[PDB]
Design an enzyme around this catalytic site. Structure first.
Site, short mmCIF file in Angstrom:
data_model
loop_
_atom_site.label_atom_id
_atom_site.label_comp_id
_atom_site.label_asym_id
_atom_site.label_seq_id
_atom_site.Cartn_x
_atom_site.Cartn_y
_atom_site.Cartn_z
N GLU A 231 8.70 75.81 23.20
CA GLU A 231 8.19 75.27 21.53
C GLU A 231 6.54 75.54 21.98
O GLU A 231 6.41 76.19 23.21
CB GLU A 231 8.46 73.70 22.47
N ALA B 84 2.90 75.79 21.31
CA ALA B 84 1.70 74.16 21.05
C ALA B 84 0.51 75.22 20.19
O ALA B 84 -0.46 75.27 21.22
CB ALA B 84 1.40 73.83 22.80
N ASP C 149 2.72 69.96 40.19
CA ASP C 149 2.00 70.99 39.35
C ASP C 149 0.76 70.59 38.48
O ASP C 149 0.91 71.79 37.15
CB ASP C 149 2.71 72.15 39.54
N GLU D 33 -4.20 73.65 32.91
CA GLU D 33 -3.82 74.59 32.76
C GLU D 33 -2.35 74.81 32.13
O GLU D 33 -1.44 75.42 31.50
CB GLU D 33 -3.48 75.64 33.42
N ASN D 34 -1.52 74.23 32.73
CA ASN D 34 -0.87 73.27 32.45
C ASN D 34 -0.28 72.23 31.21
O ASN D 34 0.68 71.51 30.89
CB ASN D 34 0.53 72.82 33.52
N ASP E 163 5.54 74.36 31.38
CA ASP E 163 5.41 74.61 32.57
C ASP E 163 6.20 74.00 34.31
O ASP E 163 5.01 73.85 34.41
CB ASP E 163 4.12 75.70 33.19
C1 A0H Z 1 -7.89 80.38 26.63
S1 A0H Z 1 -6.54 80.28 26.47
O1 A0H Z 1 -5.86 78.68 25.49
O2 A0H Z 1 -6.06 81.41 25.90
N1 A0H Z 1 -5.49 79.60 28.14
C2 A0H Z 1 -4.36 80.45 28.30
C3 A0H Z 1 -3.14 80.15 28.68
C4 A0H Z 1 -2.79 80.59 30.16
C5 A0H Z 1 -1.03 80.28 30.16
C6 A0H Z 1 -0.15 79.69 28.95
C7 A0H Z 1 -1.18 79.54 28.46
C8 A0H Z 1 -0.50 79.29 26.73
C9 A0H Z 1 1.03 78.64 26.47
N2 A0H Z 1 2.22 78.75 25.75
C10 A0H Z 1 3.29 77.98 25.55
CL1 A0H Z 1 4.47 78.02 27.08
C11 A0H Z 1 3.44 76.94 24.13
N3 A0H Z 1 2.27 77.32 23.40
C12 A0H Z 1 1.40 78.39 24.19
C13 A0H Z 1 -0.36 78.43 24.44
N4 A0H Z 1 -0.54 78.13 22.86
C14 A0H Z 1 -2.44 78.46 22.70
C15 A0H Z 1 -2.67 78.42 20.69
C16 A0H Z 1 -3.86 78.33 20.49
C17 A0H Z 1 -4.26 79.78 20.94
N5 A0H Z 1 -5.88 80.28 20.92
C18 A0H Z 1 -6.67 80.43 21.28
C19 A0H Z 1 -8.39 80.27 21.09
O3 A0H Z 1 -9.07 78.82 20.56
C20 A0H Z 1 -7.82 79.44 19.19
C21 A0H Z 1 -5.86 79.43 19.63
C22 A0H Z 1 -4.33 80.00 22.37
C23 A0H Z 1 -3.28 79.33 23.31
N6 A0H Z 1 -0.85 78.64 25.13
C24 A0H Z 1 -2.19 80.23 27.82
#
Ligand code: A0H
Length: 253
Positions: A85, A87, A130, A134-135, A148
């Site tokens: 899914e 997010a 966990d 970040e999770n 996760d």
């Molecule tokens: C700074 S960060 O937001 O990039 N953090 C890093 C990071 C590390 C490990 C896993 C994810 C991750 C896993 N996802 C899963 Cl599984 C389903 N949707 C997402 C998901 N979604 C998501 C949706 C929108 C955005 N942004 C970036 C900046 O702001 C506007 C939109 C980032 C991640 N992210 C993100």
């Protein structure tokens, strides 16, 4: 069922341990979702093979608004693929980096959503272990979603309890500690046991050695002090958390 050529791959959402997560769309459906790419190479080298089996087995069978759906999976030669899914509003972690601190209503709401999700996990005898920012993902409405299930079990030190850090045997109570650490971090902007080295943090966790900044309210302090007890037995149940004056007073959900 599925293969890689079933999806258009999109922008990188972020980097993980053994692999990265991508935005993706199923070709036939035009359905939008996250694709987690893991390398057979790295997950063998670290012998986490048995853990992935539990993550896939566990997350695939859970069904809750505050827990991230795993739809299916597959693999080829080099890699394994999780079909997740998506997010839309990212991690609670980036949300925290951006705003510095959270207000008492945002905190209480996340804690509530988190408790519910966890209260459900535990009734199916699943312990996350966990739990960290970040999770935690955000849904299209900004609802918290546990993602996760990496070191989850049907049974870096910053969010672990004394009992785990010290090797001992642990129960559904680890998650209430993590909840305490989260509640603190949301309000203050850093975890209660943070330090410059793993070794210091370890001592600080074991002695439950933390202090509050002045701006943290008696209500917050009480809930947190109850969750952060050295003795697993002395930690509230999920039900009591939901009923905490400070929570019911501040939570919107
Ligand atoms: C700074 S960060 O937001 O990039 N953090 C890093 C990071 C590390 C490990 C896993 C994810 C991750 C896993 N996802 C899963 Cl599984 C389903 N949707 C997402 C998901 N979604 C998501 C949706 C929108 C955005 N942004 C970036 C900046 O702001 C506007 C939109 C980032 C991640 N992210 C993100």
């Amino acid at each position: 069922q599925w293969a890689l050529e079933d999806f258009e791959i999109g922008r990188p959402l972020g980097k993980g341990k053994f692999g990265n997560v991508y935005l993706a769309r199923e070709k036939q459906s035009k359905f939008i979702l996250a694709l987690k790419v893991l390398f057979k190479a790295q997950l063998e080298k670290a012998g986490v093979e048995h853990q992935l089996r539990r993550e896939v087995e566990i997350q695939s069978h859970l069904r809750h608004p505050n827990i991230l759906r795993l739809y299916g999976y597959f693999h080829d030669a080099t890699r394994v693929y999780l079909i997740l899914e998506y997010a839309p509003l990212g991690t609670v972690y980036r949300e925290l980096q951006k705003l510095s601190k959270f207000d008492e209503q945002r905190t209480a709401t996340y804690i509530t959503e988190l408790a519910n999700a966890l209260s459900y996990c535990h009734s199916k005898r699943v312990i996350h272990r966990d739990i960290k920012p970040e999770n935690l993902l955000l849904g299209s409405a900004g609802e918290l979603k546990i993602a996760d299930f990496g070191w989850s079990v049907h049974a870096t030190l910053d969010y672990l309890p004394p009992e785990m850090i010290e090797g001992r045997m642990h129960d559904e109570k680890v998650d209430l500690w993590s909840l305490g650490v989260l509640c603190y971090e949301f309000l203050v902007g850093k975890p209660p046991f943070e330090a410059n080295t793993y070794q210091e943090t370890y001592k600080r966790i074991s002695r439950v050695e933390f202090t509050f900044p002045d701006f943290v309210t008696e209500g917050a302090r009480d809930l947190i002090s109850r969750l952060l007890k050295h003795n697993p037995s002395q930690r509230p149940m999920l039900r009591e958390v939901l009923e905490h004056p400070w929570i019911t007073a501040n939570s919107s959900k």
